[PDB]
Amino acid sequence: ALLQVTISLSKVELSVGESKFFTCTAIGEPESIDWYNPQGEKIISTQRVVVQKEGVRSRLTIYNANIEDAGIYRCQATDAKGQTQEATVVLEIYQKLTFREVVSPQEFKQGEDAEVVCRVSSSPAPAVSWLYHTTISDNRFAMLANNNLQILNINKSDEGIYRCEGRVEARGEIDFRDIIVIVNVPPAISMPQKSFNATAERGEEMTFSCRASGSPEPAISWFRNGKLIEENEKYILKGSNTELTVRNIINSDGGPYVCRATNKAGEDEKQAFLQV
Ligand SMILES: *[C@@H]1O[C@H](CO)[C@@H](O)[C@H](O)[C@H]1NC(C)=O
Numbered sequence: 001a002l003l004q005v006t007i008s009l010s011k012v013e014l015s016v017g018e019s020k021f022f023t024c025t026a027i028g029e030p031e032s033i034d035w036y037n038p039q040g041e042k043i044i045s046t047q048r049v050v051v052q053k054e055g056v057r058s059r060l061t062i063y064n065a066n067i068e069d070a071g072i073y074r075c076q077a078t079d080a081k082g083q084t085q086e087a088t089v090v091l092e093i094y095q096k097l098t099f100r101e102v103v104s105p106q107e108f109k110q111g112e113d114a115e116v117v118c119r120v121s122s123s124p125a126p127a128v129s130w131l132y133h134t135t136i137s138d139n140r141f142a143m144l145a146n147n148n149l150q151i152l153n154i155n156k157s158d159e160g161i162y163r164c165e166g167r168v169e170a171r172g173e174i175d176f177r178d179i180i181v182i183v184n185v186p187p188a189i190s191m192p193q194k195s196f197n198a199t200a201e202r203g204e205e206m207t208f209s210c211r212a213s214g215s216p217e218p219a220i221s222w223f224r225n226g227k228l229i230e231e232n233e234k235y236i237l238k239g240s241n242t243e244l245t246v247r248n249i250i251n252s253d254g255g256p257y258v259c260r261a262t263n264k265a266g267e268d269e270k271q272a273f274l275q276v
């Protein structure tokens with residue numbers, strides 16, 4: 001029948017930092033068109049909260065909305081008569097699922113107690129969850145109150161990808177992250193023979209096998225008497241230094257040849273004895 005006011009939106013809810021504008025149409029012939037913050041102050045223009053007034057509409061733009069922004073805004077018109085209609089819009093500022101400062105290739109040592117870390121958060125407290133394939137909860141895996149999952153005896157097969165999924169049932173909002181898990185495993189030397197034997201002056205020869213086990217794969221360095229063993233014409237090592245061949249053994253070559261195997265998770269050393 002008579003004067004009335006409308007707004008582009010009625011109920012909006014945006015993340016923090018998000019921006020948006022609303023338009024207030026005043027169907028009629030208003031002399032007055034004014035906005036009001038949820039505090040009841042007649043909005044004045046600021047380059048972050050801007051108010052543009054044209055014709056019979058009025059646009060209110062909120063840039064990078066913070067938390068002091070939520071509330072019931074009101075556009076309110078007034079003609080030459082005392083008639084004074086208004087429309088209102090409800091703004092809700094919230095927090096998207098954030099995953100701040102969350103490193104991946106997370107490394108852990110074979111035996112230790114691992115805690116895979118996922119720093120995730122949202123306005124209504126997120127509902128986090130850990131997946132491997134697919135869910136997980138096997139009396140060795142458990143989610144701490146801080147959202148991280150722990151693995152008590154992080155065996156190396158445990159090594160893999162883990163999804164830290166998070167949902168906000170209040171918004172049907174979901175988002176995950178995929179973390180890589182690395183199981184560092186100290187070196188484990190393996191050499192079937194640690195006691196060899198050739199004949200002196202005769203141009204005999206002997207190869208010495210030393211294999212290891214670890215993640216990363218261990219580096220095998222040999223030592224003799226007190227010096228690192230280099231190749232030379234005397235010794236020839238091939239299989240990434242897993243096979244030490246001593247050429248032209250005399251009497252002086254008899255005795256321990258020590259085998260070192262190293263990685264970032266420790267070291268193992270075993271030696272062979274060469275009898276002449
Ligand atoms: C050569 O040395 C090994 C050391 O394990 C020993 O068992 C073996 O008896 C030796 N060979 C001979 C023919 O004695």
Ligand SMILES: *[C@H]1O[C@H](CO)[C@@H](O)[C@H](O)[C@H]1NC(C)=O
Pocket residue numbers: 155156157158
């Ligand atoms: C689990 O698998 C890894 C594979 O590298 C191995 O290191 C570990 O010994 C295994 N543990 C069990 C329970 O068999």
Ligand SMILES: [Ca+2]
Pocket residue numbers: 017018019064
């Ligand atoms: Ca923006």
